Design a protein around this ligand. Structure first.
Ligand SMILES: CNCc1ccc2c(c1)[C@H](NC(=O)C(=O)Nc1ccc(Cl)c(F)c1)[C@@H](CNC(=N)N)C2
Ligand SMILES: CNCc1ccc2c(c1)[C@H](NC(=O)C(=O)Nc1ccc(Cl)c(F)c1)[C@@H](CNC(=N)N)C2
Lengths: 336, 335
């Protein structure tokens, strides 16, 4: 336990809300941090029980609270109104650093699954640059696994626990609302996606021995988790993924059963004004979408899954603490 | 044409020289940016013939003249000496704005090459925030193409003319003189560089039917142009790029023949005191480098190339007006 502090390359002249936030909350990053490599030592990590995740969660909640002010905030029977101006929105990498008297241990084992023993260890003052990207089903613009795809879970035999898939090669996704003003769409190359779900398919095949491994859409619930929901330029995008998570892996080969056109999977997206908040239990209401072309070009670097003869996996999400876990898995706050 | 005026978020209690200059030379940026989108309006652009570049160049010359004072300045055979204190140096974004009666037309075509027809244009009072980064070969801390790498030249078939490559994704470069006090070095991830040079190689392959596209170092000349020269915290870095611009593109793929060690290209750099000035024809001598760790973490946002079966390309630069053109290419002053 300690109280971490943040570092970033935020610009004071930038009116983008992440830059404003980091300027009023963080410290100038050090242009050349140097890692103290600890060989010979073997310590244990648990990405699922990490306070760094809670601190970061708190910080991102405060950030959204001060940056994205909704027209309405409804909780129970009480509603709160205030000015909801359109803003400049684009996440910047956040570093989390330990104060004097504390250190940050970093796992260098490159196939480490987040829980248990890690042996190539090291000492850093601050973490790597982390973009606080809030999304569901798909993890966007994070860091890639440097070798094979990695499966992360608090308990894999417990189907109620969220599975994090760390990809080794990103899959580009391009969402856009062209110049219906709430109708948007995402484009994904079907080849990269087929390859990706092939690799993820076999990596899941290893953990679940002789099963037909299917990928199906989210069963139901709030649109935030039943769709790939995310924030693009201050606008809340909800993108249908029924043609994305639609496949079958069996006997060492994968088959995409989702619809595609000319080698491209297109997600039908909707920009919503009424959102179910991730910070707290309640609803937030924002202004109609801005004018012009609203496009986000992102990289899919991770998956969020939930497991149900056959093993079926569906896209998950909703708890952003897992989104922070996908990047904070290699770190651990330590005493000196 | 007119007499433009600058606007910035420059800050009067900052002793950083860009701020010191901008506070007394510029105007508070304006909380009210109002863009005027236009339908049915072609205007023709020529980034290579834009006076805004000349004005910018001139007051960047003024800025440097008042900020970075060399111990000696030799021009025309005449030597001028003065105090050469080490200062705080870090570029800030400058906006260029049109006075009363004038406006700045802005191209919105995301793939506009600087020259020729542009349709989707708006009207602004001031340009975007531009950091006056003086450099050769590599363009640092600039804007990225909103996507698709862009090739710029007033005539590509004219080998004598500087090519500006506008990148869509930045390539981080970390230069450092560690705590020989003139020996420095730069670090660049090789993967991002081979990626960049491959895509650039193919967008070059488009303009050049299909010859073998080679990347070779600068043939010769002053160190300022034969190396990636730039200023970091007041100190003049000259970094070798013989292992950066050295590779071959053939077969629709590129392979790097430049040398590397475990995924990291390291440029051998030298902090120099005697400098061939970019402001004018002459030389300036400064004081020895400051003590401590001298590090700059920059982003490569563009390239400056020169073209010689095979088309050979080499890093170029020297004329900083080209460094202003890569950012001012989309704007034009009108009445
Ligand atoms: C199986 N997991 C179910 C679960 C588990 C935990 C939580 C949720 C769902 C709820 N998450 C969210 O509403 C949420 O992320 N919205 C959201 C908003 C904007 C963007 Cl861009 C976005 F990508 C997502 C949240 C509770 N809130 C309410 N019940 N109203 C916390
Ligand atoms: C093919 N183009 C050749 C060309 C064309 C025009 C010009 C040059 C070269 C000369 N540029 C420079 O000396 C120059 O940029 N130095 C410089 C200083 C500091 C930093 Cl940080 C830096 F990155 C560069 C300059 C003439 N001056 C002298 N010959 N003394 C103008």
């Amino acid at each position: 336990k300690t109280t971490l502090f943040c570092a970033s390359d935020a610009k004071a002249y930038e009116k983008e809300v992440h830059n404003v936030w980091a300027t009023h909350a963080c410290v100038p990053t050090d242009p050349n941090p140097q890692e103290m490599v600890l060989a010979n030592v073997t310590e244990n990590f648990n990405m699922w029980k990490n306070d760094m995740v809670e601190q970061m969660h708190e910080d991102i909640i405060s950030l959204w609270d001060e940056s994205l002010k909704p027209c309405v905030k409804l909780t129970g029977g009480s509603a709160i109104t205030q000015a909801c101006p359109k803003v400049s929105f684009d996440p910047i990498p956040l570093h989390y650093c330990a104060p004097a008297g504390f250190a940050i241990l970093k796992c260098n084992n490159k196939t480490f699954n987040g829980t248990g023993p890690c042996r190539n260890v090291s000492t850093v003052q601050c973490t790597h640059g982390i973009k606080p990207v809030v999304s569901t089903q798909l993890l966007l613009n994070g860091s890639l696994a440097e070798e094979e795809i990695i499966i992360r879970s608090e308990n894999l035999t417990n189907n109620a626990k969220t599975i994090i898939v760390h990809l080794n090669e990103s899959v580009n996704i391009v969402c856009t609302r062209p110049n219906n003003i709430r109708q948007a769409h995402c484009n994904i190359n079907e080849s990269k996606w087929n390859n990706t779900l092939q690799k993820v398919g076999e990596e899941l095949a290893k953990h679940f021995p002789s099963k037909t491994i299917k990928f199906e859409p989210s069963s139901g619930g709030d649109l935030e988790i039943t769709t790939h929901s995310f924030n693009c330029r201050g606008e809340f995008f909800y993108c249908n993924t029924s043609d994305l998570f639609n496949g079958t892996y069996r006997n060492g080969t994968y088959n995409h059963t989702g619809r595609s056109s000319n080698g491209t999977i297109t997600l039908q997206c909707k920009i919503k004004q009424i959102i179910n908040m991730w910070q707290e239990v309640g609803r937030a209401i924002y202004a109609p979408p801005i004018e012009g072309e609203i496009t986000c070009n992102s990289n899919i670097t991770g998956l969020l899954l939930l497991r149900d003869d056959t093993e079926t996996f569906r896209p998950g999400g909703g708890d952003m603490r897992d989104n922070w876990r996908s990047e904070l898995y290699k770190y651990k706050v330590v005493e000196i």
